Design an enzyme around this catalytic site. Sequence first.
Site, PDB file in Angstrom:
ATOM      1  N   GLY A  67      85.058  28.406  96.495  1.00 44.37           N
ATOM      2  CA  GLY A  67      84.198  27.564  97.297  1.00 44.37           C
ATOM      3  C   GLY A  67      84.505  26.089  97.103  1.00 44.37           C
ATOM      4  N   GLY A  68      83.516  25.263  97.435  1.00 49.08           N
ATOM      5  CA  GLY A  68      83.650  23.831  97.261  1.00 49.08           C
ATOM      6  C   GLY A  68      83.481  23.344  95.841  1.00 49.08           C
ATOM      7  N   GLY A  96     117.816   2.648  92.153  1.00 52.03           N
ATOM      8  CA  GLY A  96     116.395   2.386  92.036  1.00 52.03           C
ATOM      9  C   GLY A  96     115.733   3.173  90.925  1.00 52.03           C
ATOM     10  CB  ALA A  97     116.662   6.270  89.125  1.00 51.90           C
TER      11      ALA A  97
END
Lengths: 131, 489, 244
Positions: free
Chosen positions: B150-151, B385-386
């Site tokens: 459920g929620g 960019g790593a």
Amino acid sequence: IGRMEKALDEYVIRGLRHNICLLRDVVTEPRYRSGSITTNYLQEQYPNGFKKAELTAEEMQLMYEVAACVHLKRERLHYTQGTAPSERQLYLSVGAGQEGETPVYVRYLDDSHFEIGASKHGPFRKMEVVW
Amino acid sequence: PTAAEDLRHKKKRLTAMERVQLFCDPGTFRERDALVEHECHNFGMEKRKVPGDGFITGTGKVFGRPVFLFSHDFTVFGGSLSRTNAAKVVRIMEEAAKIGVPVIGFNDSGGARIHEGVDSLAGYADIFLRNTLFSGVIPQISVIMGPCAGGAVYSPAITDFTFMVETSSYMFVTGPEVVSAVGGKLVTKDELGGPHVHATKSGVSAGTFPNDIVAMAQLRRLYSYLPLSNRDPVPVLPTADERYRDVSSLNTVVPTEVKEAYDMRDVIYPVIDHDSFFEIQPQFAKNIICGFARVEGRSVCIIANQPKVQAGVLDIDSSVKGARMVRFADAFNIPIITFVDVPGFLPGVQQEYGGIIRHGAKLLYAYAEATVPKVTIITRKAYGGAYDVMSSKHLRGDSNYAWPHAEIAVMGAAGACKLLYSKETAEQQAQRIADYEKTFCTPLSAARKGFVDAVIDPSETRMRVCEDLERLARKQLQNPWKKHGNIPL
Amino acid sequence: DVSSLNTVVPTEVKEAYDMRDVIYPVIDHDSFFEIQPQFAKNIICGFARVEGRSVCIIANQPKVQAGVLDIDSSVKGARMVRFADAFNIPIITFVDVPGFLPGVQQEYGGIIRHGAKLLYAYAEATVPKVTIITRKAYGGAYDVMSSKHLRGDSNYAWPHAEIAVMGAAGACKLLYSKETAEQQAQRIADYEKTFCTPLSAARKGFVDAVIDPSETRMRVCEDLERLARKQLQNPWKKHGNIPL
Ligand SMILES: O=CCCCC[C@@H]1SC[C@@H]2NC(=O)N[C@@H]21
Ligand SMILES: O=CCCCC[C@@H]1SC[C@@H]2NC(=O)N[C@@H]21
């Protein structure tokens, strides 16, 4: 020989296997301590593969006692300041089915001294562990 | 006297009270509220009132330090929440917000209680708001011992860490009945939301345990690392280990060939204290490692690449994992230590079709926003960019170190040689790629520019880390005034 | 060990007892400093130590005038609470009140103003509070004497307590206007049995737990040790406007 026995156990090797178990079992065998051996000794005493010899009752009891002492010593490290315990009652059992539940006590009277006994209100032995 | 719990144990399952007893100290649990009823008066519920009302909330005490907890009860009404169940949880969280204490909850609810109507939704909303407001103030840990549908699934999600039990637990938003109704596929509950699925596929669960007993035993160990609140300092424990212990095995870990792989744990383990690693999410995105560890008796955060799996290449899942870990570590003033070995980002259409641009920016945002002391060690390589993302010196890094065989370049030698000579005479490969790699694929240029503090022998890493982490104990840095950031979701 | 508290409260509801017999066991030995001992004797205020730290004590006394709140008692308690909170001193209260003192002189003297001072002092306070309900708490007196709804930290009750809107007679009168005569015998007893007990207040969630009277020292020490670092703040004001 005793020296070798003792010196085998203090050789810490980590990262790969070895044959120290075979050397230990061969040295501890009463046939080897009898005095004389042969060249066909190994396969004569190891017919099917290799199987290390087991432990007697007192050795397993001592291992239990040392394990309980180590558990308590490492437990006391995590507690903060003086809010730490000094006595427990543990239930040691090797194997996935709890074979031979052995109640154990511990008291930690000093930094490297305990008062191992069967349980509460049982006679104590005061062994020593340094780890 | 072992009444009314024989029915539970017969199904090879434990009870909420037994779990609470196992977690805390032997005799330091004080149950807060115990005589509360649902007062529903609908659908034939005016009868069968229950004293506890399906919840056990108390205070407890772990390792001499206070805690707060609550546990669902499966026997009573299936563990459903109500207007009345949620009140106790709200009171506990509010009290743990006034005092600097964390909260740990053992979820077992079968869903909402239909007989209360929208009051269950009201309770869910209140719990959600408390979780949202108090996240980043007090650490929140959640463990799922049984069904959770459920929620109600959302409140564990907002919590910092979620753990799962192997045999008898699952979690999902919608049941398989609705899936069969709409799509027409028959999937079991375990096939849908089992612990393995969330351990490997969705990345929600932070770990899995084989038994409840082991779960408690290791949850205590995890709790021993955390700080008590937002304003409290990082805990420091006594330890016989010392910074002068010899580590010369690090001189040989890195192979002399550039195409052979190695295990980064062989570098991680010597630096930290013995038997003090607690890996987080061990089975998800294995190309990156995150967890907690101690250095000279103080807890730190570990984030390192692994060339064993997929050549240690950054990805979507790795980015999310590292970003969450960095954000949590910084929120509570925990030092960060990183080991860098990355050839770049994973190339593929699926990656762009899945939004690599959004996800890869999360790790960079987390590293740049952080203000805790940082230590970075570049073992072998860092390209493109790593190199920028993995805590480079320009992102307000404190101290950066490199090993003598490292490489820091814009890209691989082949691409640079191609772009630097468009139609240069053929066979240019042999006499240009070797020269370029020799001249610029080495830490000498990056050291000349000033991007690494010093080039060190691999045997001095423990000494340097302990020295720097001891000196940096009292850094005070502050970001410009904001209501809050805007992270790329 | 404090087991003498199990017998302090008499089993009759119309007999009186001395609240000091409850105050003294909980605090440390020979550590009470009464404030204003000869004025408004129906309420006790002073300083005391619990496990080596100074706390503030405010308790009713059924010995004098059935432990009924009044003008003078309200002023005394209000001043004590305000001073204690101003300097971050924990407050411990013991509750036993049947209501307010009825009389024309009281209204001609302004009970409405004075009784509000104690409520203001209790609500404005931000120090840790501990409350113990020994026997009874009725009407607005229950609200005033540090009820759980006024941001109280922990509240406890004893197994023979009573928390109701008013006495059984008035409730029975208002709930049955012209019901058949002799209604007293078979209605007042039933109403007191069903609703003059801490079970209903515990069901609503107004008391944390119902405890044995022998555990009061343990509970108070535990709570006062845990609450050592509470940080609560009121909305921004130049200052309040207390009913003078
Ligand atoms: O030379 C051709 C393929 C080179 C790929 C090198 C690795 S693979 C993933 C990452 N992305 C790059 O551009 N380089 C690295
Ligand atoms: O039953 C008639 C008189 C009951 C008075 C009970 C005490 S006296 C002062 C206080 N005010 C009340 O209304 N009840 C209590």
